[PDB]
Write an enzyme that holds these catalytic residues in place. Structure first.
Site, mmCIF file in Angstrom:
data_model
loop_
_atom_site.group_PDB
_atom_site.id
_atom_site.type_symbol
_atom_site.label_atom_id
_atom_site.label_comp_id
_atom_site.label_asym_id
_atom_site.label_seq_id
_atom_site.Cartn_x
_atom_site.Cartn_y
_atom_site.Cartn_z
ATOM 1 C CG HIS A 41 -0.546 0.203 2.510
ATOM 2 N ND1 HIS A 41 -0.105 1.430 2.987
ATOM 3 C CD2 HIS A 41 -0.508 -0.694 3.520
ATOM 4 C CE1 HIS A 41 0.219 1.227 4.252
ATOM 5 N NE2 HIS A 41 0.010 -0.040 4.615
ATOM 6 N N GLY A 143 2.157 6.015 10.270
ATOM 7 C CA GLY A 143 3.569 5.876 9.933
ATOM 8 C C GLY A 143 4.196 4.583 10.445
ATOM 9 C CB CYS A 145 2.337 0.887 7.493
ATOM 10 S SG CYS A 145 0.661 1.425 7.934
HETATM 11 O O1 QIZ Z 1 -4.276 1.907 8.632
HETATM 12 C C1 QIZ Z 1 -3.408 2.694 8.255
HETATM 13 N N1 QIZ Z 1 -2.453 3.187 9.071
HETATM 14 C C2 QIZ Z 1 -2.286 2.965 10.451
HETATM 15 C C3 QIZ Z 1 -1.656 1.844 10.991
HETATM 16 N N2 QIZ Z 1 -1.520 1.596 12.301
HETATM 17 C C4 QIZ Z 1 -2.017 2.487 13.149
HETATM 18 C C5 QIZ Z 1 -2.687 3.673 12.757
HETATM 19 C C6 QIZ Z 1 -3.204 4.615 13.679
HETATM 20 C C7 QIZ Z 1 -3.825 5.748 13.240
HETATM 21 C C8 QIZ Z 1 -3.968 5.996 11.882
HETATM 22 C C9 QIZ Z 1 -3.489 5.113 10.960
HETATM 23 C C10 QIZ Z 1 -2.829 3.922 11.363
HETATM 24 C C11 QIZ Z 1 -3.336 3.202 6.813
HETATM 25 C C12 QIZ Z 1 -3.935 4.612 6.717
HETATM 26 C C13 QIZ Z 1 -5.427 4.552 6.924
HETATM 27 O O2 QIZ Z 1 -6.080 3.721 5.940
HETATM 28 C C14 QIZ Z 1 -5.479 2.517 5.656
HETATM 29 C C15 QIZ Z 1 -6.271 1.608 4.978
HETATM 30 C C16 QIZ Z 1 -5.712 0.416 4.592
HETATM 31 F F1 QIZ Z 1 -6.474 -0.488 3.941
HETATM 32 C C17 QIZ Z 1 -4.392 0.119 4.847
HETATM 33 CL CL1 QIZ Z 1 -3.729 -1.400 4.337
HETATM 34 C C18 QIZ Z 1 -3.605 1.027 5.528
HETATM 35 C C19 QIZ Z 1 -4.141 2.237 5.966
#
Ligand code: QIZ
Ligand code: QIZ
Lengths: 305, 300
Positions: A41, A143, A145
């Site tokens: 992603h 951040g 990920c």
């Molecule tokens: O989850 C996501 N990042 C986060 C990870 N861990 C913790 C978080 C805490 C706060 C905000 C983001 C956080 C991204 C951005 C948001 O949308 C998506 C959607 C998705 F399908 C995928 Cl694979 C990734 C993301």
């Protein structure tokens, strides 16, 4: 004495963390030999995540679109490919700090250490378990990920998890190092929900053994149960069924403490039907399920890495 | 989102762990530049434990009595000296993995990561707080002496603890990296007991703020309290008094959540009076006190 939630020493994994930037997205990558692994992603902007065709997005990318930074040195990407939900960036430099390693897929109930990173920089290490619903109850911010989960066996790092996303309930989802998601989750911005979580029964039993090893024994009783009667009671409290494999793995702890597994099962059974009655076990008022039998043996015996 | 007990990455400290052997005793040492720091009790025999005279025992030692091993390489001790309860072994090789570092003495309530080691080899990392009674509730076995506590705010390691001993209740005592014990403890096998431990009130308040940040609100109430009335209640539950310094440190969390410190204090009073009623806060059924306000801001 004492019993703590303990992670593996993170040093061997810190030497592998890099920062991967593609356009406006910056996340973490795992640099092993001449390859940097990161969530696929990273190639997505806003529209892309809604309905992404990763194969088509990746074909439009060139090596120079990927900015990889290891410490204060920029690595040059000489190839890119995708394996499931992981992106593999071939670089021109092999990581001199690459430890002995394996990619392993873990099962629910298994524990691992998470090295939470931001901008390719390690910020914390914590211990967690793969929940029976295939989520992890992590602690991750935007951040994070590309942060990885691992175990250490002797001097070999077993990478088992890479962080991809946070679900609406605050729990986390990710893949093994071959890009296969743990759980029925997809790397796309869509309505997704973790299934109802259950308690890792074998891990609660292991933690009850750790408590007895540390002198906390009020919950012990004279009783024993059959595995079938225990499982019937366990199903009613959203506890995972205990298999003969689990009884066998608890064997050394049973021999060490003098409390048979089914004897400990009858203690757990009474704890579920009556509660803790104002008492605590290892300083906790809830039954802990994020310590496997191996974790208890490792911590209560002093295995080193 | 999520809130975990989180330790600092231990890599910078693993590269400093070595084994120190003196006669029959083997424990851990911390190798920084050309010096290996370890508990001075490594020089003690069986008869010299109830009342050892460390100065006199050390004068009888030579550099060749200390066997230092870094990985599979033996280091050569070229000097030895004592600073309070810490032994300092000068070696002929500077540790190439020496990170940017400082020795800091912490106060009760402060947290740190512990890298538990055996035979100079790291086995685990966990998060600890210095208890108000100056002990730590660690997880240590025989051979863990010399394991260190540290914080890594940026790329500099602040070493704040070196493990020396386990008290009869299973809690642990040690020193800063200058050899000064935390607490009224001595490195002797004499009758020693930790004072009655109390809860780190400012840390519980910080954790209640972490819970609100993560969407927990059930414990909030419409009450506020005076700092004096809160202290009178809290102390009946073996909670440390909350000072104006603590109210000030909780300021940014108060501003971020929109819940004043004394408003959160009234929630804590009610939690102490009622208990959790079958509910949890951040996955816990007890009030957590090993997260400082700085830890909460950093993690959230
Ligand atoms: O989850 C996501 N990042 C986060 C990870 N861990 C913790 C978080 C805490 C706060 C905000 C983001 C956080 C991204 C951005 C948001 O949308 C998506 C959607 C998705 F399908 C995928 Cl694979 C990734 C993301
Ligand atoms: O406490 C000690 N080492 C341990 C540390 N942590 C954890 C343990 C767990 C089990 C058994 C030893 C453990 C030693 C040995 C016992 O007596 C003393 C006395 C002393 F005055 C000093 Cl400074 C050290 C020790």
């Amino acid at each position: 004495s004492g019993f703590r939630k303990m992670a593996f020493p993170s040093g061997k994994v810190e030497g592998c963390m890099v920062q991967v930037t593609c356009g406006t997205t910056t996340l973490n990558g795992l640099w092993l030999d001449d390859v940097v692994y990161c969530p696929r992603h990273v190639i997505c902007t806003s529209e892309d995540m809604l309905n992404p065709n990763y194969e088509d997005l990746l074909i439009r990318k060139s090596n120079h679109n990927f900015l990889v930074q290891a410490g204060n040195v920029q690595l040059r990407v000489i190839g890119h490919s995708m394996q499931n939900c992981v992106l593999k960036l071939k670089v021109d430099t092999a990581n001199p700090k690459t430890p002995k390693y394996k990619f392993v897929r873990i099962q629910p109930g298994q524990t691992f250490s998470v090295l939470a990173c931001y901008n390719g920089s390690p910020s914390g290490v914590y211990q967690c378990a793969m929940r029976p619903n295939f989520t992890i109850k992590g602690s991750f911010l935007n951040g994070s990920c590309g942060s990885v989960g691992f175990n250490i066996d002797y001097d070999c790092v077993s990478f088992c998890y890479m962080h991809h996303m946070e679900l609406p309930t605050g729990v986390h989802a990710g893949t093994d190092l071959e890009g296969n998601f743990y759980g029925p989750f997809v790397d796309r911005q869509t309505a997704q929900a973790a299934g109802t979580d259950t308690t890792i029964t074998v891990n609660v039993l292991a933690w009850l053994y750790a408590a007895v090893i540390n002198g906390d024994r009020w919950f012990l009783n004279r009783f024993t149960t059959t595995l079938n009667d225990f499982n019937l009671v366990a199903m009613k409290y959203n506890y995972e069924p205990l298999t003969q494999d689990h009884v066998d793995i608890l064997g050394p702890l049973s021999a060490q403490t003098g409390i048979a597994v089914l004897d400990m099962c009858a203690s757990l059974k009474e704890l579920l039907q009556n509660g803790m009655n104002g008492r605590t076990i290892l300083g906790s008022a809830l039954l802990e399920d994020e310590f496997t039998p191996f974790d208890v043996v490792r911590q209560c015996s002093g295995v080193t890495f």
